[PDB]
Amino acid sequence: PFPYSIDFVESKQNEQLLKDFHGERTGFVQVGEKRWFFPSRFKQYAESLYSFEARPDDTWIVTYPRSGTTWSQEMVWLLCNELDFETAKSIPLTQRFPFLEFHLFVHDEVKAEFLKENEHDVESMKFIEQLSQPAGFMLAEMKTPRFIKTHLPISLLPPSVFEQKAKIIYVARNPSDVAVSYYHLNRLYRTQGYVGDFETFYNYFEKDLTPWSPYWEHIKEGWAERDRENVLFMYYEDMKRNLPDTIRKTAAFLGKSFSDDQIDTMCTHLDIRNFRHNKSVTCEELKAVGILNSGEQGFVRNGQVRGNAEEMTDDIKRRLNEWTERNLNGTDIRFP
């Protein structure tokens, strides 16, 4: 029984969101007292998501979007699979490490556009149809240890995750870098279909009118569970600053042990320079059927000027600082 209220965003705000986010064609919902923001299909799939059955040997990565999710998945999959770089290369990350709630973001009307554009290729059309289907079906059929990605906040996870004490890695990233990276994600994925500029996107983000917001509640729930034996909480900028420490700490939490030589191959694999050429970054299959906007691969290839993105203005930077102050005053949460 899904325990939280699911309500359509107020009419006029919902109308404006549909003008700016072309990946949704019915409307947006707010869930529970915290008003977790999702596209309309959340209402259709809330029960099946919440009743998903976790196993005690699952590995879950839980993040706010663009909080180091992909890099962490690649790291964790390799640590739990004997550093099998060969298999990591040949199977796509999205099959090795499926995204539980991706199907929420494939609207029936948008899927129909994708199918039109791929109508002469039977295998492209099967692929697009499967995107619509819950990952949970294929996850439930697996007979081996599972790797699950989600952006669902702690309070919306299947309760079976904590009942089974599945291992959870929670990664937090500072709001400035998340605002800019999430803005690019919303332009890159036609499932989101955002058409506007950064300042308009920041305005939505600051009002918790972007998927999986409220951002500060997402971070605070992660922080509130980090003492549990089955939760590892890390800040993105700590992880990136020291790969050998990150790899070892993560391995030890997962109950794996590796030589200094093995740690070094993982450090090279995950280094900024080599990771830019990783298949999990390029995402060549979503690009092949045109669900990725190929005109938005600038940010993918280049990233942002560290601590001063081209998109940032002094006014938005000031608003980020004040929003951070309001949300973190009286907590011990502090970004590196």
Ligand X SMILES: COc1cc(C=O)ccc1O
The one of Cl ion, ligand X, none whose footprint includes residue 37, by CB under 5 to 8 A per kind, is none
Q: What is the DSSP letter of 68?
A: S
Q: 163 vs 9, 32, 43, 151, CA distance in Å?
A: 32, 21, 24, 19
Q: How far apart are CA 159 and CA 164, in angstroms?
A: 9
Q: How far apart are CA 84 and CA 6, in angstroms?
A: 42
Nearest approach in angstroms of CB 63 to ligand X is: 8
Nearest approach in angstroms of CB 188 to ligand X is: 8
- 60 touches Cl ion by CB under 5 A: no
- 210 touches ligand X by CB under 6 A: no
Identify which range of 39-47, 106-114, 227-235, 309-317 contacts Cl ion by CB under 5 A.
Answer: 227-235
**Site pattern 127..166 for Cl ion (x: CB under 5 A):** ----------------------------------------
Q: What is the DSSP letter of 2?
A: -
- 194 touches ligand X by CB under 6 A: no
**Site pattern 84..103 for ligand X (x: CB under 6 A):** ---------------x--x-
Q: Name the packing angle between helices 314-328 and 198-206 (round to 10°).
A: 10
Nearest approach in angstroms of CB 156 to ligand X is: 15
Q: Which amino acid is at 272?
A: I
Tokens of 186: 């919303």
Q: What DSSP element (H or E) covers 12? A: helix 11-20
Task: Looking at residues 108 to 127 of the shown chain, list those that interact with ligand X (rule: CB under 6 A).
Answer: none
Q: Nearest residue by C-beta to ligand X? A: 191
In 3-state terms, what secondary structure has residue 292?
strand
Tokens of 234: 């890390």
Q: Which amino acid is at 181?
A: S
Q: Which of 103, 107, 151, 184 is catalytic?
A: 151
The one of Cl ion, ligand X, none whose footprint includes residue 173, by CB under 5 to 8 A per kind, is Cl ion
Q: Exactly one of 66, 173, 248, 269 binds Cl ion (CB under 5 A); which one?
A: 173
- 73 touches ligand X by CB under 6 A: no
The one of Cl ion, ligand X, none whose footprint includes residue 191, by CB under 5 to 8 A per kind, is ligand X
- 105 touches ligand X by CB under 6 A: yes
- 174 touches Cl ion by CB under 5 A: yes
Q: Which amino acid is at 193?
A: G
Q: What is the DSSP letter of 62?
A: E
Task: Looking at residues 228 to 247 of the shown chain, list those that interact with Cl ion (rule: CB under 5 A).
Answer: 235-237
Q: Are 135 and 85 in contact (CB under 8 A)?
A: no
Nearer to ligand X, 176 or 280 (CB): 280
- Kindly determine how many residues on this chain lie close enough to bind Cl ion according to the rule CB under 5 A: 6
Catalytic, 151? Answer yes
The one of Cl ion, ligand X, none whose footprint includes residue 64, by CB under 5 to 8 A per kind, is none
- 64 touches Cl ion by CB under 5 A: no
Q: Which amino acid is at 166?
A: A
SS (H, E, C) 161-204: HHHCCCEEEEEECCHHHHHHHHHHHHHHECCCCECCCHHHHHHH
Using a 10 angstrom Cβ sphere, with 0-12 exposed, 13-18 middle and 19 or more buried, the burial of residue 3 is exposed
Q: How far apart are CA 323 and CA 317, in angstroms?
A: 10
Per CB under 6 A, residues contacting ligand X are 65, 69, 99, 102, 105, 185, 189, 191-192
* Residues annotated as catalytic (active site), given as ranges: 151
Residues that bind Cl ion (CB under 5 A): 173-174, 235-237, 335
